[PDB]
Amino acid sequence: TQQPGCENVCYDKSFPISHVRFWVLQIIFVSVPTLLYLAHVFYVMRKEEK
Amino acid sequence: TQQPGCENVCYDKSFPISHVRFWVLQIIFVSVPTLLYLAHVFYVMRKEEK
Numbered sequence: 001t002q003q004p005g006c007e008n009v010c011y012d013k014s015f016p017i018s019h020v021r022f023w024v025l026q027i028i029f030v031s032v033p034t035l036l037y038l039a040h041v042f043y044v045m046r047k048e049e050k
Numbered sequence: 051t052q053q054p055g056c057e058n059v060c061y062d063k064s065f066p067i068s069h070v071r072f073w074v075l076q077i078i079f080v081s082v083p084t085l086l087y088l089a090h091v092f093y094v095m096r097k098e099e100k
Contacts, residue, residue: 002054003053003054004052004053
């Protein structure tokens, strides 16, 4: 097309969110509960020590 | 502007009819009655001859 700004809106509509950033968000969300549990177990060990 | 076709419509709106063509139409319209009268007088002379 020759329409100014058509490429921007068409890319935006085609890709509401990039796949790579979506996957980064997914892996972060998957990892968060594991880190929470690990730190909770660390605090449990701190309780055990005292 | 960068909009395709904007120049065409803007020129069309700015100049509904060119001044030169408008003046040509005006002079033709002014001349027509004179030519009609001249040819009518020519026919009147043809009547006079016969």
